[PDB]
Amino acid sequence: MKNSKAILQVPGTMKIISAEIPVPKEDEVLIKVEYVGICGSDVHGFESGPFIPPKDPNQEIGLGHECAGTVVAVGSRVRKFKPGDRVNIEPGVPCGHCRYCLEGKYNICPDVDFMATQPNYRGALTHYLCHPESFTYKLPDNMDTMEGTLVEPAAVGMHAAMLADVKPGKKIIILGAGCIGLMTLQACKCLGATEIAVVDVLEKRLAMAEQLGATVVINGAKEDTIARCQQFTEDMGADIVFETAGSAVTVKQAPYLVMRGGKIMIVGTVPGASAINFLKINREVTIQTVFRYANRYPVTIEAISSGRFDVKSMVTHIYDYRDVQQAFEESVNNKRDIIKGVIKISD
């Protein structure tokens, strides 16, 4: 009957204020949010605010973009969905008419409306929200709304592996065993790769990498990453190197890890500049940045529903919605022990 939202009142400080229940436009669904994931971008938003200040002096800055729930109402022209459907949402709604949308790259649309961002700052941390039916997806019966929430980061890794043309016979190195690195690992497995090395510095993440199917795990703090990778690839380098931690160490490392003619994929981020040794990759190596996802939700939902892609095992912490402040503090303070945290929104 009533709504509320968690707002970034000032960087580092969340609270929950009242909000009106949105009315779905004729092509939208109205969803009762049940789970909201916490990823790097939300934690950075909590710490710094959005990097474009709101045009409005006292704009209510929402947070959260990975979410799922149950349809409560639908707009008058919605046929795909009905009240009671459990769904997730793809949080980036592109313009649909620019050169990039029309060319199959809507993810890089210059007018994408992405949750908890620039023009509108609509956060998924709320009891009720509206979303276009075209970017909402029904969950299989064997997939709960917490799994539906984690389709979004899984889609990030799926898009990277698909962009990279992962295939059997391609040796893969994944730099980073955080959430996105583990998603990329499982995506590489779904695309048939059989030799996957995963590099991180935390033994708990490498334990999870091995559980999720890494062929070899390498602790860059206790081992020589370049030497161990050269052994892994028989001194030839890997066909594909994924950089997923967004750190300077890893990006600068990837040139030394890839084979001639191979690919380096930068899965998101990299906030600072990084010095690249192009001499080491002068034989037609490709470096490509990877940005969110395009047309990946169905195949990712498929992969999770089948059991081949395990997102439930990645959830290490579940926070109640009214405890959202601690959820974001711990996501900063105890980053060491969190693979993936989610926020449960019950009444």
Residue choice 28, 66, 133, 147 for contact with Mg ion (CB under 5 A): 66
* From 1-9, 28-36, 106-114, 147-155, span contacting Mg ion (CB under 5 A): 147-155
Decide whether 105 or 204 has the Cβ nearer to Zn ion: 105
Phi first, then psi: give them for residue 124, nearest 5 degrees. -75, -20
DSSP string, 91-128: SEE--SSSHHHHTT-GGG-TT-EETTSTTT---S-BSE
Using CB distances below 5 to 8 A depending on partner kind, what does residue 94 bind out of Zn ion, Mg ion, none? Zn ion
| Shortest spacing between CB 151 and Mg ion, in angstroms | 10
Question: Of 184 and 233, which has the nearer Cβ to Mg ion?
Answer: 184
How far the first Cα of the chain sits from its last, in Å, is 11
Q: From CA 127, how far away is CA 320, in angstroms rounded?
A: 12
Helices and strands of the chain, counted as H and E runs: 10, 17
Choose the contact partner of 255 out of Zn ion, Mg ion, none; CB within 5 to 8 A by kind: none
Phi, psi for residue 183 in degrees, rounded to 5: -60, -45
Contact region for Mg ion (CB under 5 A) — 2-10, 44-52, 63-71, 134-142? Answer: 63-71
Residues 21-40 that bind Mg ion (CB under 5 A): 39
Out of Zn ion, Mg ion, none, what residue 109 binds, judged by CB under 5 to 8 A for its kind, is: Zn ion
Between 153 and 255, name the residue whose CB sits nearer to Mg ion.
Answer: 153
Q: Which region among 20-28, 61-69, 183-191, 256-264 touches Mg ion (by CB under 5 A)? A: 61-69
Q: CB-wise, 103 or 347, nearer to Zn ion?
A: 103
* Tokens 């709960």 found at: 144
Residues 50-109 contacting Zn ion, CB under 5 A: 94-95, 98, 101, 109
Q: What is the rounded distance in angstroms from the CA atom of residue 183 to the CA atom of residue 62?
A: 25
Quick one: the chain helix, strand, coil %, rounded to 5? 30, 30, 40
Residue with smallest beta-carbon separation from Mg ion: 39
Which of Mg ion, Zn ion, none interacts with 200 (beta carbon under 5 to 8 A by kind)? none
Minimum separation from the CB atom of position 42 to Mg ion (A): 8
**Whole-number Cα distances in Å, 207 to 200, 201, 226:** 10, 11, 20
Say if residue 280 is exposed, middle or buried (CB neighbours under 10 Å; 0-12, 13-18, 19+): middle
State the residues that interact with Zn ion by CB under 5 A.
94-95, 98, 101, 109
Q: Which positions lie near Mg ion, rule CB under 5 A?
A: 39, 66, 152-153
